[PDB]
Amino acid sequence: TGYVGLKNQGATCYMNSLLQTLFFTNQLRKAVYMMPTEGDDSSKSVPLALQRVFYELQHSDKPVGTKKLTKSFGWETLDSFMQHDVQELCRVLLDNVENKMKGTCVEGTIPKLFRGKMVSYIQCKEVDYRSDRREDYYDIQLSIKGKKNIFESFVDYVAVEQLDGDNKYDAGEHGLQEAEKGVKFLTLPPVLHLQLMRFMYDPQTDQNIKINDRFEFPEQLPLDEFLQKTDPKDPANYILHAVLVHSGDNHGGHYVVYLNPKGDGKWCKFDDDVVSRCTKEEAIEHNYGGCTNAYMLVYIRESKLSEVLQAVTDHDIPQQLVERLQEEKRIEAQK
Amino acid sequence: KKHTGYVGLKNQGATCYMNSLLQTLFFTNQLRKAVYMMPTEGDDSSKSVPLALQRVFYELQHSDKPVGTKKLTKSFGWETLDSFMQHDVQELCRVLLDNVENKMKGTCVEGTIPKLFRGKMVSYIQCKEVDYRSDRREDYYDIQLSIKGKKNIFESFVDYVAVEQLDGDNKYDAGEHGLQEAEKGVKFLTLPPVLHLQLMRFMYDPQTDQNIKINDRFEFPEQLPLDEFLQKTDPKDPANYILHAVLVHSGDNHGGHYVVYLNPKGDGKWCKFDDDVVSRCTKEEAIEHNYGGHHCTNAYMLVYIRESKLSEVLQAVTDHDIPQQLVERLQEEK
Ligand SMILES: O=C(CCc1ccccc1)N1CCC(O)(Cn2cnc3cc(Cl)ccc3c2=O)CC1
Ligand SMILES: O=C(CCc1ccccc1)N1CCC(O)(Cn2cnc3cc(Cl)ccc3c2=O)CC1
């Protein structure tokens, strides 16, 4: 394979899958390498710990550990991962990286890669008043129940909700007014993170249940029809890059991530320390479900594929970062 | 029978339903005219779907030989059998029509796609044991009809607007309350002039193993009245439709044979478009012989046209409908 896996040092659940997905976001990895962490503390700095993990994944021939990384942002118990969905963990990592990039050239790199623009609108019917609420988004949670595939999920995602009964819109001064509620996509990020809503509740037993309904996702995803304004020369055509899967329908289950890091159709399976070649069928079709199925998908805009997946070489790692990390080994290599 | 005056599309490869869809849209004359008017002078030949569509339509109208679609497929992006098998026919039509509609913005043909294919529907989901109810309005350019256990298109529509119990799981995700048992209801506010109907013959067999094709018998009429399925019926424009084309598939699964039957003029004179081979056929071969065995060759999509809009939708198209700069550009490429 040529790629190195991550150690299983506890009940980190989806973390190892997320780290591999972000590590192969080459443009993000390069940005992480450029972070000025010379003065940061080794124990408390998430950006530094994140640099160490990416560095070891790129140079180490043995499984890479993540104890100091989890210890940096405080998720040191299985519970910590039970409290949050996968996207909320991705937010803690990206926000730690983005803050450290403030006051630099690479500032705003995370928003450029992951952030999208949408608007939540409420339009009155009898009277002329419209409330537009602009909101950035770094991920999209798709409803899969009764939905055949991503295409059908996006159609439902943009459905128009009606407010006309007792649930009339409180327009403040206008009081109660029949209105329509909806969401409109303004832009789609170069790297599209999609989460499938497979965790459900379930009031009778008062527990969260995973639904294993079949949900299909293509290798090529066209999303131009859902944008409010289309941009010629930059079509909203996306290419599948990673497939995060889970088995067991519980936090105590099995977590793995499938990736074609080069976006060339050559897929690999990342199962903790074991990285093995696999077919497109094992990575895609075998994860549609219908208890091992996909819960998160990563798509990359085709026009930005060369830039997002640009090759990262040793020259892209600052010497200061290398000297510090290698200095760290000498202390630990004292064994 | 072998000389019909119509040209076919070459069998480039595993484009699956593409050629059948293209012939469908080509004979939607009102749409074809709008495509000719799109301002494509500043378009890139290598990445412009609208220009590629103009090229295919132009060649289908003037060529004496099978027309190629490599430029269209190249610009579209789907160039593998695996790609088409991952998408339904309605998504291909949606991506194409939406791309052409964007191109028509700011022109005399702006909004042709929505006027011809866009209909509106309203649905509700009411929880049985919780005070949670959600009403929604939605635009649709196509309809997926269930055929399993359905005798004809009439029963399929009845099942479409029937109140379906959401029990089991199945259970409706009522946000804070759901999963919850609920009842779902859908109804048609309007029907578009051109009605695209997909028949759900490709279903996933769960172990079983993989998706299996449903060859059960499903009957569709030449004249389709859909007035009782609307929420409001108005005279002088009842929802009477005339079958315009029948997309059919033979074989099974990944490897299949695609054919489309069309009476382009809406006069009942049917023809069989089998890629480069086009030949006249009888109504029975286009309709009854596609109901499904009792086999391998049956319909998976139908195209009806509102009877009041028939003359307008199927308006005659002439060379004078093609701007000269478009003609000159295509003649230059040749
Ligand atoms: O690892 C787990 C717990 C076990 C699990 C794994 C995979 C699928 C279902 C359950 N999770 C991470 C992935 C996910 O976070 C996926 N996800 C994300 N956002 C959602 C938002 C809503 Cl509103 C409803 C469901 C989900 C959801 O399932 C669910 C919990
Ligand atoms: O060409 C193919 C694949 C081979 C094939 C062709 C015709 C009939 C069965 C299988 N397809 C295009 C037509 C279709 O896209 C029809 N269709 C459309 N929408 C559906 C929605 C649901 Cl929820 C379930 C089934 C279908 C469906 O079969 C199925 C795939």
The CATH code of the domain that includes A171 is 2.20.210.10
Q: Is A254 in the pocket of ligand 1 (CB under 6 A)?
A: no
Instruction: Say if residue B150 is in the same domain as residue B258.
Output: yes
Question: Which method was it determined by?
Answer: X-ray
Burial B52-91 (b: 16+ CB within 10 A, else e): bbbbbbbbbbeeeebbebebbbebbbbbeebbbbbbbbbb
Cβ pair A108, A95 in contact under 8 A: no
Quick one: tokens of A161?
A: 């909700």
Task: Quote the CA–CA distance of B156 and A88 in Å, as a whole number.
Answer: 43
Q: Tokens 């192969």, residue?
A: A24
Instruction: Say if residue B151 is in the same domain as residue B258.
Output: yes
Residues of A within 8 A of B98 (CB-CB) are 224-225
Query: In whole angstroms, how far apart are CA A151 and each of A127, B42, B89?
Result: 34, 31, 12
Task: Quote the CA–CA distance of B306 and B193 in Å, as a whole number.
Answer: 5
Is residue B2 one of the residues assigned to a domain?
A: no
Q: Is B11 in the pocket of ligand 2 (CB under 6 A)?
A: no
- Residue nearest atom 26 of ligand 2, based on CA coordinates: B200
Cβ pair B28, B87 in contact under 8 A: no
Is residue B267 one of the residues assigned to a domain?
A: yes
Instruction: Say if residue B202 is in the same domain as residue B285.
Output: yes
Is residue B33 one of the residues assigned to a domain?
A: yes
Instruction: Say if residue A168 is in the same domain as residue A317.
Output: no
Q: Is A193 in the pocket of ligand 1 (CB under 6 A)?
A: no
Is residue B1 one of the residues assigned to a domain?
A: no
Instruction: Say if residue A269 is in the same domain as residue A329.
Output: no
Resolution of this entry, Å: 1.9
CA angle B251, B255, B259 (to 5 degrees): 55
CB spacing of A219 vs B94 below 8 angstroms: no
| Encoded amino acid at B25, one letter | L
Instruction: Say if residue A266 is in the same domain as residue A150.
Output: yes
Is residue B252 one of the residues assigned to a domain?
A: yes
Instruction: Say if residue A152 is in the same domain as residue A47.
Output: no
Beta pairing partners, A161: A181, B136
Instruction: Say if residue A120 is in the same domain as residue A109.
Output: no
Q: Is B200 in the pocket of ligand 2 (CB under 6 A)?
A: yes
CA–chain centroid gap for B82, Å, is: 21
Quick one: tokens of B239?
A: 């929802």
Instruction: Say if residue B112 is in the same domain as residue B135.
Output: no
Contacts of A3 by beta carbon, 8 Å cutoff, 6+ apart: A57, A261, A268, A270, A275
A20: exposed, middle or buried (Cβ count in 10 Å: 0-12, 13-18, 19+): buried
Query: In whole angstroms, how far apart are CA A213 and each of A198, A199, A293, A335, B13?
Result: 8, 11, 9, 51, 33
Active site residues of B: 16, 257
Best of B135, B164, B208 to disrupt the A interface (most A CBs within 10 Å) is B135
B220: exposed, middle or buried (Cβ count in 10 Å: 0-12, 13-18, 19+): buried
Instruction: Say if residue B22 is in the same domain as residue B101.
Output: yes
Is residue B3 one of the residues assigned to a domain?
A: no
The question of whether A13 is a catalytic residue gets the answer: yes
Instruction: Say if residue B86 is in the same domain as residue B16.
Output: yes
Closest residue in A to B175 (Cα) is: A201
Instruction: Say if residue A172 is in the same domain as residue A266.
Output: no
What is the 8-class DSSP label of residue B198?
E
Residues of B within 8 A of A161 (CB-CB) are 134-136
Q: Tokens 């108005």, residue?
A: B234
Range of the domain at B313: 8-118+308-334
What is the 8-class DSSP label of residue B33?
H
CB spacing of A200 vs B78 below 8 angstroms: no
Diameter of chain B measured on Cα atoms: 68
Is residue B53 one of the residues assigned to a domain?
A: yes
Residues of A within 8 A of B78 (CB-CB) are 220
Three-class SS of residue B324? helix
Cβ pair B278, B7 in contact under 8 A: yes
Query: In whole angstroms, how far apart are CA B293 and each of B76, B176, B187, B205, B299?
Result: 35, 47, 31, 20, 11
Quick one: tokens of B91?
A: 């998504």
CB spacing of A225 vs B179 below 8 angstroms: no
Task: Quote the CA–CA distance of B228 and B219 in Å, as a whole number.
Answer: 19
B238: exposed, middle or buried (Cβ count in 10 Å: 0-12, 13-18, 19+): middle
Work out how many domains chain A is built from and give that number: 3
* Closest Cα in chain B, distance from residue A182 (Å): 10
